[PDB]
Design a protein around this nucleic acid. Structure first.
Lengths: 47, 78
RNA sequence: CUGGUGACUAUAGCAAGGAGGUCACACCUGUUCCCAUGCCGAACACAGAAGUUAAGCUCCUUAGCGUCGAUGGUAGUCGAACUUACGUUCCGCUAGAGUAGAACGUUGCAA
RNA sequence: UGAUAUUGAAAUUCGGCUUUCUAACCCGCACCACUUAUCGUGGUGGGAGACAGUGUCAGGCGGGCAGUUUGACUGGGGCGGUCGCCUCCUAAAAGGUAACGGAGGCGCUCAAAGGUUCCCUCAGAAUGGUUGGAAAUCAUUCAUAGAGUGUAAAGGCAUAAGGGAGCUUGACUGCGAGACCUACAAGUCGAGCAGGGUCGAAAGACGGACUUAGUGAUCCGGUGGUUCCGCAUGGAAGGGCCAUCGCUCAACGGAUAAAAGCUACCCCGGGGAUAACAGGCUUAUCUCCCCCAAGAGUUCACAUCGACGGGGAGGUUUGGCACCUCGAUGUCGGCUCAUCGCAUCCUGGGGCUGUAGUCGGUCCCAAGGGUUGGGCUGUUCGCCCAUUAAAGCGGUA
RNA sequence: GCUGGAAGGUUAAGAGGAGUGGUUAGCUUCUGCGAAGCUACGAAUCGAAGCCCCAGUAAACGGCGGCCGUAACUAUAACGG
RNA sequence: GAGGGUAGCGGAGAAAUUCCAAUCGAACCUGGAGAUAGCUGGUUCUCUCCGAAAUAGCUUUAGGGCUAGCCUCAAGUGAUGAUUAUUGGAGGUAGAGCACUGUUUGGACGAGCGAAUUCAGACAAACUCCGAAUGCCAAUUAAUUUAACUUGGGAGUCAGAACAUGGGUGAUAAGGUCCGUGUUCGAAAGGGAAACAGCCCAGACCACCAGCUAAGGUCCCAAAAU
RNA sequence: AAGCAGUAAAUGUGGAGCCGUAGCGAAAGCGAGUCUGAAUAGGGCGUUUAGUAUUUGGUCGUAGACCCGAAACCAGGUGAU
């Protein structure tokens, strides 16, 4: 099933994002590389 | 008895918003359409939904894209 | 007059019959190298002895198909007068036939 | 029903349960006195006793009683059905356009089914070989789309938007000249500027998916961040700003956090804006009258009957519409009194006949006169009994 | 619905006070620790009736069925599934 | 018969919603009180200029409102308004046609061949190889004309009807009902149709015992040709 | 303005107060420029920077608000001739 998820920056200041994810297709937590406004650089977001 | 019909959707208002040989600005909408009925020519772009808009200032000309095909162009006249 | 590359509704096309090659476009040989395959040097990429116009390609002819297409009339219809289906005045179709038509045409190499 | 105050005094195993005692409190229990009154008060004896009764707080039952809610559209109302969004037709080649008109969907999905760079071209038909649909795979030819495009439809796409592979996360941040639509609130597209980036040799492309549906104002509440404020002062509680979460509020511009029925006991303000009777328009239905002739009639269409089909008249039935009347036009049968039409029941006059005669059938002219009494049923209607030349059909609220 | 019962489950006020946070005498890397007072919110455990549960009660409220074949009965079924 | 008791969130009832001073599904009097009424009725002197609407959206909304459209007054900008004449353009209706999807008639074609192949002939709002007349958007282009736009004060309107024309629905019924496009009535008197809001002609400032015409008419009623 | 004087008199005193001359931002705050924003880079709202006191007319709000008209509700009393 679909669950709305949020992405939090790692080891730095938080620049949150909102996406969607399927519960069965990706049972774990997804990680991506997104731009961070506070650090002014691309970083890794989890959860 | 009863009926099973009666539903409808709000009418979207497409067509040509500009006339041939008319001066337009740099962001005017020239045509609203579903799919491609008129192709983009010179100085003409395309949007998310298939819509034609001008990029520069000038007249509007509807031309012929060969056989059974159409295009619109904007020319920087004055 | 052959080649490269752009512009126009097949009047630029499909098909059939003929002529040509060592300058060029092609065919063909091979897989050490730059590269690749559901497997497959068949194709993509390379190094190139030979050999032939067979086929691609250039040119000529053919109205078999496809395309373009008048004049005249007809259908329909703006407006007007009677009335309810008929007059008068403009515009003017499809379809079918007489017919153009085996393409014109710009620019830098080469002979 | 429990906790607590009035509420005391002693003992048992583990802050209490249980069992004893009398002074609190209680007795519409007896005797005495105020008093020739037992209403009341006081005293003396009995009974019960920290129980009961009363005060405050808490849980449960509670139409016995009280205040209110119980939606709209609608060829009258009730019943049935529907309410927001998307795609066609009606829609009259710009845009827009209604009806309980004619057809279907939506309340999603995808971590690659997104971005970029390369490569490629489908469906169908014929033939051949271990024959399962010459189409479960091997191979050849014809084949401009009939194949695919996640999901309805329309508009598009073979420069592919269709199929394959590599890399990657732009499904980024702050914005935004101009424009479409529009009562408002909302909705749509957008070149370009700056800060990080992915793919590509490079020019370049990238702010989700070929496009158009997958969504809900405000108030209130929860979580993360913050040069903001914070009631004498420094903090804090509490607010503001930014991001995000919780509503089949689906009657989907959402009355409130919280809501169903009967009225023949009924009442008030309005309406012929809207029904039941009669009038009016129409004639589906109804009653009659015709066209053609396959046939029946021993032969023979038309003495008589008239299948399959077609064209009319009338306004007596059941309907459709809702034009006058709701500050009133009073129904069904029966009685009294009638009047009009002819599509004629009797009487008068003619033609044909499958008319021998007495009787019959059918058609034409004709409205002067006539056209019964009872039983059953409120009945119109109908059946029955007995007669008669005949026991006619309709209009007039 | 009414009556009887308490083996188990749920349940208030009120008792109970494990802990959390705010303030600061002091110390100290300087924006952290931090005693006692005062203050805001509190967790384990105890707490009746009622409800779930068990049984009875109809001159209490109430309720009292289908499908398919067959003669020592022509049709029809005493009977059978 | 006399003397007494029970009083309206109440009494009494051999029970009918029966009675409680000619009234009772809740008595009478006075106050809150000039309760509320999105509903009917009514609203008093005279002249001049201009002059509608019965539509869209939303609505516990449907005979009520709000915003927009249309009317009026004042102050502002200044060809920005309408009709024709000549070009350019978007958009598939009438008609026609079978090249697509479906329907259908008769013959050749064995794999039953009036459709797996071929030749003729027809049908379609949800078919199109094609395609008008009108209407619509502009030019910064020429003659004629008089309007358009912006900001402010005040409104009314949300029940429409008939006729001609293209349609849906009904039954190619209705003075039926719902849409598009015009005229009239509404809010319009005068002439014609016998009389007759919507049909035809034509828009009344006042006075005259003056002339020419429109629609329809000229034997008499009854003006005009036996 | 209230108050004081004055004939219940229209006139003097009374400068608490109010409007305007400067906006922007939720606020701290800045200021002809402010907010958003890393950045007047762009954008929003400002730089008109002539008002103010009284009064005639039109409209709106609070009071019954153009007038007449209920079926009903609550409170206090009077009635069993």
């Amino acid at each position: 099933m679909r669950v709305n998820v949020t992405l939090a920056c790692t080891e730095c200041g938080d620049r949150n994002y909102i996406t969607t994810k399927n519960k069965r297709n990706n049972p774990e937590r997804v990680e991506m590389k997104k731009f961070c406004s506070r650090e002014n650089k691309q970083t890794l977001h989890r959860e | 008895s009863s009926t099973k019909n009666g539903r409808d959707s709000e009418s979207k208002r497409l067509g040509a918003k500009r006339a041939d040989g008319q001066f337009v600005t740099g962001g005017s909408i020239l045509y609203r359409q579903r799919g491609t009925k008129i192709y983009p020519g010179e100085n003409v772009g395309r949007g998310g939904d298939d819509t034609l808009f001008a990029k520069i200032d000038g007249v509007v000309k509807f031309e012929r894209k060969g056989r059974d095909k159409k295009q619109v162009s904007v020319y920087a006249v004055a």
